[PDB]
Amino acid sequence: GSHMLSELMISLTTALDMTEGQPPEHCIRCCWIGMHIGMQLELSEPELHDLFFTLLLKDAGCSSNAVGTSLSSVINFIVKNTGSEQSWTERILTTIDILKNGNDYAQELIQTRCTRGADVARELRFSEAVAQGIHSLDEHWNGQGRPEQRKGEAIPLFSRIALLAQVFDVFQMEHSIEEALQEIMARSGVWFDPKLVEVVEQLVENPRFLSGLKATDISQRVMNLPPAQAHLPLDDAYLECIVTAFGKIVDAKSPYTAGHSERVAVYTDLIARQLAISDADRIWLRRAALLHDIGKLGVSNAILDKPGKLDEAEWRAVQAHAAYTEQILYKLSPFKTLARMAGAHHNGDEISLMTRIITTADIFDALSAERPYRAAMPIDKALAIMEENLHTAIDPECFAALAAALNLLPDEYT
């Protein structure tokens, strides 16, 4: 099978959205709003393409997941980013200086985020315009935005559309369009480009734009917006790119669990080898293993870690971890053209196999590793818990394969 670029981005974008995203398909809605604003400025097709992605990828930078930030969190951030690579003593003094104002911190935060997101865009082989324009998202019309304090048309057009689009959605959904329309009107000339604001003003008159915003299938409709260029099929090389890029995003978003994705991928491949899965399937499986983690900032299975608890029954239900895994995989996995064609009115098994393997790995990791707070479970102990708990919650073609695979490993490894 294959993926379309637009399609995969939306999916990945939506998921990473759930962390800090704010609302369930926030990015999707901005795209829809932003494309529509753009659509009315008579942009070139390339611009509309670049805009489409800028809108989708605006939050790529965000290193946060989610009455304010913890002091610790704040300090940790300053340290870890600045002061960078100087006497210890300097770093403390510098971090203190930032902490105290104002301001300064906020500037650091944006600069980091904006630079980081711009970096993602580049990694993903979008144009500099896209990267620049994720970077200036937080500039303001009046020259009061960060991090560069650009004003007016110093600001890239995409950022202007994007920021405006973004704010509007948040209001749109927190209150009432009219409230939203009002709010943006309020910031016109301050945060926003007045001209753009006007446009939104029109769109609102235009129903069907509204219908589209409040549609269940909005994700499908957004797809129809861009130029065809957005729909490129993804080859293997690009996929590596996406995965590799996103993995960095995940590692940044959840520091505490880092290396969890890699481990699961490893277990997953090991199980797969045992099942004599094909080379190609394995390749998906390894990517899938990392990707399925996106979102899933929700606690694992199941608190867990917690040394104390960790007894049965209560997680018999919690086993519907996917559940989510299956759904996400289906959205993720490569697809068959004839199959997609043959459903314009109105694979399943594989997903189940995939889900079972990855899920089994996911469970095995959860029992082991229990590393922070430190508490690794012995491999064979963890293996025993599954079989102890199973047929009920544990596949068993995989469980065997897991065991067989682990067996081959050096026994040094506990």
Sheet with the most strands: spatial strand order: 1-2
CATH topology of one domain: Hypothetical protein af1432
Please provide the count of β strands: 2
Main beta sheet strand tally, sense and closure: 2 strands, antiparallel
Terminal CA distance: 39 Å
Going by helix content, strand content and strand pairing, the class is mainly alpha
Helical element count?
Answer: 20
Query: What is the helix/strand order?
Result: EHHHHHHHHHHHHEHHHHHHHH
**Strand share of the residues?**
under 5%
CATH architecture grouping of one domain:
Orthogonal Bundle
Indicate the overall shape. globular
What is the CATH homologous superfamily assignment of one domain?
Hypothetical protein af1432
Range of helix content = 55-70%
CATH class of one domain: Mainly Alpha
Keywords:
monomer; 20 helices; two-stranded antiparallel ribbon; mainly alpha; 414 residues; Hypothetical protein af1432; manganese; metal ion binding
Structure, described:
The chain has about 425 residues and is mainly alpha-helical. The chain has a domain at about 235-410: Hypothetical protein af1432 (Orthogonal Bundle). About 60% of the residues lie in helices and about 0% in strands. The protein has 20 helices and 2 strands. It has helices spanning about 5-20, 25-40, 45-55, 70-80, 90-100, 105-125, 130, 155-175, 175-185, 195-205, 210-215, 220-225, 235-255, 260-275, 280-290, 325-330, 335-340, 350-365, 380-390, 395-405, and strands at about 5, 235. Strands 1-2 form a two-stranded antiparallel sheet. Helix 2 crosses helix 8 (about 155-175) and helix 14 (about 260-275) runs antiparallel to helix 15 (about 280-290). The longest helix is centred in the first third of the chain and has 20 residues, at about 105-125. The radius of gyration is 24 Å and the shape is globular. It starts with a strand and ends in a 7-residue tail after the last helix. About 35% of the residues are buried. Its cofactor is Mn(2+). It catalyses: 3',3'-cGAMP + H2O = 5'-pApG-3' + H(+). Keywords: Hydrolase, Manganese, Metal-binding.
